[PDB]
Paper text:
During E1-catalyzed activation, the C-terminus of Ub is adenylated and subsequently becomes linked via thioester bond to a catalytic cysteine residue on E110,11. This is followed by the recruitment of E2 conjugating enzymes and the transfer of Ub from the E1 catalytic cysteine to the E2 catalytic cysteine in a process called E1–E2 thioester transfer (or transthioesterification). Previous structural studies have shown that Ub E1 is a multidomain enzyme in which each domain plays a distinct functional role in its three catalytic activities of adenylation, thioester bond formation, and transthioesterification.
Using an approach that involves the generation of a stable E2–Ub thioester intermediate mimetic and covalent trapping of the E1 and E2–Ub(t) mimetic active sites in proximity to each other, we here determine the structure of a [name] E1([name])–E2([name])–Ub(t) complex. Inspection of the resulting electron density maps validated the placement of the eight copies of [name] and [name] and revealed unambiguous electron density for eight copies of Ub(t) from the [name]–Ub(t) thioester mimetic into which Ub(t) was manually placed. The final [name]–[name]–Ub(t) model was refined to R/Rfree values of 0.203/0.246 with excellent geometry at a resolution of 3.43 Å. The ATP binding pocket of seven [name]–[name]–Ub(t) complexes harbored strong electron density into which AMP (but not the β and γ phosphates of ATP) could unambiguously be placed. Much to our surprise, two distinct architectures of the [name]–[name]–Ub(t) thioester mimetic complex are observed in the crystallographic asymmetric unit, with the differences largely centered on the positioning of Ub(t) relative to a fixed [name]–[name] module. In four copies of the [name]–[name]–Ub(t) complex Ub(t) adopts an open conformation similar to E2–Ub(t)OPEN structures, extending away from the [name] and [name] active sites where it engages in a network of contacts to the FCCH domain on the front of [name]. In both the [name]–[name]–Ub(t)OPEN and [name]–[name]–Ub(t)CLOSED complexes, electron density corresponding to the isopeptide bond between A141K of [name] and Gly76 of Ub(t) and the disulfide bonds between the [name] and [name] active site cysteines used to stabilize the [name]–[name] interface are all well-ordered.
Author numbering:
A (entry chain N): -3 to 76
B (entry chain J): 6 to 98, 118 to 180
C (entry chain I): 12 to 590, 599 to 646, 650 to 773, 797 to 1024
The structure:
Amino acid sequence: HHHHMQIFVRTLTGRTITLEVESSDTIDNVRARIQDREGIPPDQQRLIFAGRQLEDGRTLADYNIQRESTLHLVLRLRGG
Amino acid sequence: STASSLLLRQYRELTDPKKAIPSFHIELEDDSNIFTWNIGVMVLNEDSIYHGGFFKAQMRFPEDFPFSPPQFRFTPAIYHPNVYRDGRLCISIVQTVESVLISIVSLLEDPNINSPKNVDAAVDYRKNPEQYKQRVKMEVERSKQDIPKGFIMPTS
Amino acid sequence: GEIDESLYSRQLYVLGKEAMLKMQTSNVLILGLKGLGVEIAKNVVLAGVKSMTVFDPEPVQLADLSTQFFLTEKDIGQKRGDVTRAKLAELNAYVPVNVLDSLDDVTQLSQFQVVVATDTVSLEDKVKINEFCHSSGIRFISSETRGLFGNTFVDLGDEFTVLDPTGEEPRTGMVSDIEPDGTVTMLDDNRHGLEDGNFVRFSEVEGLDKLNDGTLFKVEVLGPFAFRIGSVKEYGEYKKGGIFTEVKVPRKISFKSLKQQLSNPEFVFSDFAKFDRAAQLHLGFQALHQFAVRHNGELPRTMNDEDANELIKLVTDLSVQQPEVLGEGVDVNEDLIKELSYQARGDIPGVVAFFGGLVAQEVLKACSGKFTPLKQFMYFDSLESLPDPKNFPRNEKTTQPVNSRYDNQIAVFGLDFQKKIANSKVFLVGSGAIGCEMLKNWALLGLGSGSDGYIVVTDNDSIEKSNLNRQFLFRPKDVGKNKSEVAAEAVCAMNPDLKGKINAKIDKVGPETEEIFNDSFWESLDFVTNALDNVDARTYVDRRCVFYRKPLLESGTLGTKGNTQVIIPRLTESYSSSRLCTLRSFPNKIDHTIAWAKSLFQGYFTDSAENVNMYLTQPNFVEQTLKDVKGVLESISDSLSSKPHNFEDCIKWARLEFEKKFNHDIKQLLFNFPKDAKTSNGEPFWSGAKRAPTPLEFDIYNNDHFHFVVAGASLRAYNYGIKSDDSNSKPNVDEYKSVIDHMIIPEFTPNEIDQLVSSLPDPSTLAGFKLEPVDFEKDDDTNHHIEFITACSNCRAQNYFIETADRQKTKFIAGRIIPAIATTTSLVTGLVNLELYKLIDNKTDIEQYKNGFVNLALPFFGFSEPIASPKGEYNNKKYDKIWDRFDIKGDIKLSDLIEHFEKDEGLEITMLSYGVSLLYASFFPPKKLKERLNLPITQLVKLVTKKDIPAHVSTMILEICADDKEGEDVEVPFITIHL
Ligand SMILES: Nc1ncnc2c1ncn2[C@@H]1O[C@H](COP(=O)(O)O)[C@@H](O)[C@H]1O
């Protein structure tokens, strides 16, 4: 319930960025935070955690993302 | 070569039991070819329809890695809107194996129905959902024959 | 109006059909046949002009043999033009080469279209001739080379229109939004590629109805993903769709006479690092002619200071006459003019080959008008090629002539430096177009002619009659012989000094021939020069040069574009450290339908036969295939079910596949996703990169539908060994029509594996039955290979509303043919030899070397400093990521190898591989560890690969991953196991 926590995010080129966030932050809020730090347009990349595509409407606590977790960045359109 | 050297560093990072992702069981073909990987795809998500499955696949890296995208093929082929009848799946283009494999399990639960390859599975995903779930559940159970002996898989 | 597309195949893809037809109606006159003259004449004759005429009544001197490859010691005394015309006509039987005897009356220039004046024409005569050409509409082009310097002049008359500026394909792309202010927004993650000043037409714009009529709009680039065309409020409002195509508008450019340009020149810079030296050399080359007038046609003496100081005065006197050249407040740069006077008598092959190809391309633009011509002037120098005076000093004694053919080369570098060039041991990989130009320049340099040097050239290919256009060392008499062997004897006739010094081999460079090119071969060489055409071989030679720490001179051309790369050990990076799928399903360009048709051509006539040939010859194939299975079993079932008997059955199979691939599968796709289908978000399914297809109704009178059946039937008949009375050169429509009009075509209706494995007949049923798989050949025009891919691709193009392509355009995309013109090949080869001068001095200053990039279409010349090899570190120990490696002596054991790395290097070896074979891994189970930890490196490879290391192998390259003293992975060099 609103506990501070830092999480890691892996990019496509196996590079890890460290972010300081809270469980009361939406994925869209976090996705916009990775946008300004890496340079990727918002439409090109999404976020996957333990094989779960994070929707922009939910928050970090909605996906049971505790402290020192690792997010993953994947293209939005990648199907054959 | 800069291709075999790059493949080694990514093969050790995905098979070291300290950094290994529990969602994929990676082993080399004949334990000697670095450019041919036998990967076992597992969906650990409990709410997913593909839960409990072990879908065997094969990755073949070309000689011009990473300047050419590698091929990914399900053996055997699975029912998915983004998988050809040949079992193969298009890999797009600086990219790592970890990003590609994670991109694959993400497509398994959220298929890109707008750009379909199996038109049968695509029309079944949206128009006949009950039939698509039945084809996947039957596909997951037939996958249990492709388990080795002694392997345990947690949720973690 | 016919063009030999068998001889000019690679050249037609550069110049086009229309431009080559104008070239075949233009008579070219070249004045002066020194090294620069014969280099221009060779490339122009090879390019195929209507007629070639040369004029040079001067007697052949031994010093002229410095750059002219068509002169021998036996020709000394006779006229340069007469002895060269014979050897020039041999290059192209379609181009007659004549000799103009006396140019006393200038009215003889009226029968020519392009006049070329080389260095043998005085500046006073160049102006007299240009005044007659400019006032008569004749194109005038001049050029001269002074040592390591040179320039060129272009005057194409007072009226010249550039219809095509670049010769490239017009850039096109899809539009996602057109704002009312004109901001044309592209689709997601697509770059328009346009630049300011471009012009574009529009298509498929739903709402701006008057925007699609073909009116052109000026492009104002806002960013890499958008451009602006002005307010489009008059045309309506944007809804969806849109495809823009760049259109090249004509540009009528006006030229000034040579007299006008000497006073107010317009420069085109060959190197922006030396863009100030342009106006300096403009007065220097003029002063060289004033010096010749004041000295009875004499040039400034070699390394002479009295003449060099007089030239500086003439340049200063000219600066007062022409104050616009240098401009106000800029000094004369006496040091530059002094170097120009020192080399005024030099004849450098690298500079001649450079300007020879450059001016020749300007002659081609003069006859065809295909590219953008040179804007009135360009100057170029390669002063960085001069060796260090501390090792090879230059003065009036070292650079004096020695009564040899290299006198004009010694005049620049000195006698001691030319001896080292002759004592160099070089390796030329490939004897193609670049290799032929490479051996010619090395023959003029005398490279390898010394008692300590040699030349090794290897090429496993033979000479063909079609290659005689792009390979000028070969003649019709040599077709069928080996490329490297004939090119060896070709240069020995130009310079007999190389006789017995060229080792011509016919062996392919690769891992297959590591016994022939062993350690003793590579280590004895000084440097290696690449003359290859494919990337697979280039990377191997590059990885070999990195292993043995030898310099590599890399080059390559693509049409009018070309580049050079210098690779220095321990200093710069190598050539390896530099530089769809969905599109087949939803095509929007002709490239995607060809890739779809090319893959269909493989599964029809190549993969189906290999599966049947293996199902019949391997008994366990059914059980072996279980390790794609349904597609393979279906391929063998369809290949043995509809087995054709005569050629009439093959026509039926091709017509049925036409209905399946282009009518039924399209209706089945349109059944699941109609033209009005919508996605989850409510967006139209068929939008943007996706085009709603339409089913094809077969029409035998449609050229693409007809040839899909002819080629499809002829190729299937080749698989099943069926022959026909039809002519393989001309199919008859009425015969194919009576066969199809009597067929019953099934209508369309919308739609485990152990059953399939039981439907296959036994191999014993078909005893001796063999299918002949089709081996794809792009260069044969009678095997129906290109006929199928062209017809099949255009049919799918008709489905998705893509514009069809002809055979020549499809052969280009399918075969991945690299265009090659003779002008860029000679120019690029010259730049390689100018860097070769820097390899002889063993220069280590990275700024002295220069990587070149040329685009003769603009024309653009740019040079960049080579990139230094990236450095890394482990345990605070810096190393070179490209060149550094670990040297281990003896066939060490795996256990002692890890011990040597934890003690001497502090690295815990976690993995170890040998080529493409993984040998050791720290995460192996204790069973795999103890088994391999006690084996040496040679026995470790035998255990893993089941193959023995041959006795001719003396070294082994091992890739390793290791952790530092903190337990984290760190990049480390590779290992060389010295057996
Ligand atoms: N691996 C190789 N070994 C020997 N020669 C080669 C190799 N690859 C290409 N070549 C030669 O390189 C030449 C290609 O140059 P070009 O004719 O200009 O395309 C031909 O003579 C080929 O036979």
